[model samples]
Target chain A: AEGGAADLDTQRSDIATLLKTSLRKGDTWYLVDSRWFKQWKKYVGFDSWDKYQMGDQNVYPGPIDNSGLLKDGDAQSLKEHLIDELDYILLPTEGWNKLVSWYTLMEGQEPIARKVVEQGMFVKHCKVEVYL
Target chain B: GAADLDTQRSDIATLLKTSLRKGDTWYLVDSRWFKQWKKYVGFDSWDKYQMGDQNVYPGPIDNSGLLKDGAQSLKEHLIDELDYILLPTEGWNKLVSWYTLMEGQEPIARKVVEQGMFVKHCKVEVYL
Candidate 1:
């Protein structure tokens, strides 16, 4: 469910790749689970696990490093945006469009806005695929 | 669950008697939860809820044991008045519409059905 990797460095890089694709190079994404590092430290040999700052969202320049992770305001903004996008995107397609239409429709009606379109249909099918 | 059903029946009967009493009797179309007679305990019996000639309770409440206030109000509003009840089979129906209206806002479901129902009705007739 959460970003996956057997090793902390590899997992951090995977998350970084995702952040770069989203064009949030300035933003920080915290790999909040320290227990994962604790469990894997025997195999991965990450010595400075306990000292790794959990609070500040930082941005590291190097692929496997956490040096450039965000701090303070930038970190908060990044986290907030990610949460917002996740919540907004997780809605059903029709439900999402309905919400978007409702939001846009309420915005200042200037110069003859077109009629709203409402879709009415029962949910018929659902398919699920799991990848590990 | 049986106790809950009985309570719902009693509640429906109480609601009908208190609010929508007089010459009205409840009726519902055969669908979903309404298919079970026991489900209608607090309301009306199951078979009484069906559409078309499917009458759930006998005429004029004095004679029949089964009855429901909400269904009775609907029948009174539709059959007695001979006006279109505007059942929202396609969209989120009247229950949702009434809730929206209660909040002092327009019901989008009602607006959509108002325009689309004629076409939809014709389509259904063609299918039949």
Candidate 2:
């Protein structure tokens, strides 16, 4: 965990405990709205779950800068967004390739793609993989 | 009054769920702008979210759309009907409460309160 003001760490710890109780055991959390996750990541300046976990514990499990597990997006935003900071928790490879492919697709560019299966089949080509 | 409203609300929720099952995506149209915006604009009007067993999940997904639609129809059906909206915390709490209540009605609203404290860090929002 990144070091911070002692008070902040205390608060973060308290919040994490509360979340530990609220969440069902062994459940991985994601934002419902990718925008919320995207915005939150930008807000907290977190580039990984480890960094996010380093925030004040009291609110860590809570909204975490207004992004939590699950965000709702409309038709305009089709790609699922997550906190780049959470890349460590959700994506093992830093999501570089998957992100690149997604960006390329957005820019009307094409990239070579491949399908891989770890726990499930996912398409990977750029910075991050897209799970179908 | 609570029971009556609850029954009515649940019935409408079921109907909304059925409609979605038939492949219709509900849109929240803002009357002021006359535009179909994704977010429900009015808290006083009804709002609901749809929960589907699939890859897609709607935001504010707690019968907000169904409730909003029902509120509008109810107003049309009757004049001077009381308008209500579910607050965000209340919406989340109700989800947990309803799930537990479905299994054991005795627990009722407590699950929402407890889970609110446990998870979202707020008590359930009350709809008036």
Candidate 3:
């Protein structure tokens, strides 16, 4: 059990390191669904759905929503874009925290940022695959 | 629609009572809660008082300051978790319905609503 906890901690730290080094400035991360723009427009009243559309390369989806509307490829596209353009990968909440801890250790500061960045790569890479 | 809501309310009440009697443990929170407990208490807590062990009542069993004073009964806690954490709006309404049915009218249910324990609405179907 002790060993298992250590392993999890190590894995988290590693993922965090990947996120810290890889992310770039001005990358638009997608935490919520792009389709929500339409719903927002309909209900809460947004200006336009097109404004929130996950365009070809501008948006990065974090975790896919529970709804089946967003598939693996959709999430993968966001991940790929982050890696290819920003050089970072999107992570789930746990993985994101791990990355935050890594930066906190490095800079001797709190992991107090609003966002962070992936898994052991496969989880990051295959999150889309598994979600499909 | 009102009738359907009433039926759901009845089902939730029956399930809550059955779960309480059987001492069934549902996921109060997601996996994160388990991780936090392990971090705070370590394996000692697990080895000494296994959470899964039915002998350990899910009520305010651990008085090690892990929980608050006068923490709700196991049944109440289960209902509260269902109301605030697990269930969606439809599910919450069903919970409120059960509370109303079990307790007098909507008076107690009104308290829960005023406390903001219930989710206002749900986008999708809330599975108990």
- Strongest candidate by TM-score: 2
Tell me the docking grade of candidate 3. incorrect
Quality class of the docking in candidate 2, CAPRI style? incorrect
Q: Name the top lDDT candidate.
A: 3
Q: Which stretches of candidate 3 lie over 4 Å from their true place?
A: A1-88, A92-95, A103-132, B1-128
Q: Provide the TM-score for each candidate, comma-separated.
A: 0.16, 0.18, 0.17
Every candidate's fraction of true contacts kept comes to 0.00, 0.00, 0.00
Interface RMSD of each: 21.4, 17.2, 21.9
Better TM-score candidate (2, 3): 2
Q: Over the stretch A1-132, how does candidate 3's per-residue lDDT look in tens digits?
A: 222223333543454343333222343232323342223223222233444432222232222232322235433223223222233234444444443342222221222123432222221211223353
For model 3, which pairs clash? A16-A99
Predicted structure 2: lDDT: 0.29
Q: Is candidate 1 or candidate 2 better by lDDT?
A: 2
DockQ of each candidate's interface versus the true one? Answer: 0.02, 0.01, 0.01
* TM-score ranking from best candidate downward: 2, 3, 1
Interface RMSD of 3: 21.9
RMSD of 1: 22.6
Q: State the TM-score for model 3.
A: 0.17
